[PDB]
Nucleic acid binder design. Structure first.
Ligand SMILES: [Mg+2]
Length: 212
RNA sequence: CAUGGUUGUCGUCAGCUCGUGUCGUGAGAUGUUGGGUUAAGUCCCGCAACGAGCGCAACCCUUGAUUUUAGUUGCCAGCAU
């Protein structure tokens, strides 16, 4: 399967090139098979306790894929910017959670109107801006028991903070990326639209098989 | 030039900070920079930061038009004197 140019590759993935071609490297699919075996097994073994599982899709080409798998799988996700402090500053992110909860309870259950225009002026624009980040994780009460990423080159903050928390992380890696930070890495290109979906399908099946 | 309290002053300038987080051996930084915009760290997009406080703004008084209430010590149109 494809990779990225020979101009900016990472030698940590010498294990994973296979039979290169015009400008772009290609990946050892059998290695990929074994890695997805370990990762699928481990995802199932993690979520067998009904844990909390977080997805990252900060990259354009996998926003939609991550979102679709996450809504099908009932486990939390992110696609817009990674708020620096998601899990380290989780206290204050959870303050923001409580705030959003208060707003959407105040609009319907408590009194909707207390000001003359402030509701549709500011409260709704703010609630848009909150959903523009918090997405799925609004109902993630505790920390994750495991994390999925799609591009540890783009998503280094999420990777780094999960590492500091010693949360187990997993994720696809293009040739530019670095697996040594990842625990149960999967070699594959992350810029194509079909493949990232094709992997998160299996990795959401892994949790759906056992959330029951 | 021991002090309180009161006061000018930079300057009604838009700035000064902080909890948690992160980077840095560390002091420190981040946030508070940037691109725009605004009278204004005002507000939006973006960002290893997310948020908050003091300030800014607004709530106050006054002036600027008008409705209802009340019409004397004010007013005088329609009226006589
Ligand atoms: Mg003021």
């Amino acid at each position: 399967h494809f990779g990225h140019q020979t101009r900016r590759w990472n030698p940590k993935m010498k294990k994973y090139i296979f039979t290169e071609r015009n400008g772009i490297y290609i990946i050892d699919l059998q290695k990929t098979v074994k890695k997805v075996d370990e990762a699928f097994n481990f995802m199932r073994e993690v979520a067998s306790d009904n844990g909390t599982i977080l997805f990252v899709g900060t990259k354009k080409q996998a926003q939609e894929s991550v979102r679709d798998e996450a809504i099908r799988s009932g486990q939390y996700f992110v696609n817009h910017r990674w708020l620096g402090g998601t899990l380290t500053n989780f206290e204050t992110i959870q303050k923001r959670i409580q705030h959003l909860k208060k707003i959407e309870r105040m609009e319907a259950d408590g009194t909707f109107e207390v000001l003359p225009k402030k509701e549709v002026v500011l409260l709704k624009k703010e609630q848009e801006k909150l959903e523009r980040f918090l997405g799925g994780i609004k109902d993630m009460k505790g920390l994750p028991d495991a994390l999925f990423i799609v591009d540890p080159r783009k998503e280094r903050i999420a990777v780094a903070e999960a590492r500091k928390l010693h949360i187990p992380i997993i994720g696809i890696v293009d040739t530019n990326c670095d697996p040594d930070e990842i625990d149960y890495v999967i070699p594959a290109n992350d810029d194509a639209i079909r493949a990232v979906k094709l992997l998160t399908a299996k990795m959401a099946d892994a949790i759906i098989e056992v959330n029951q």
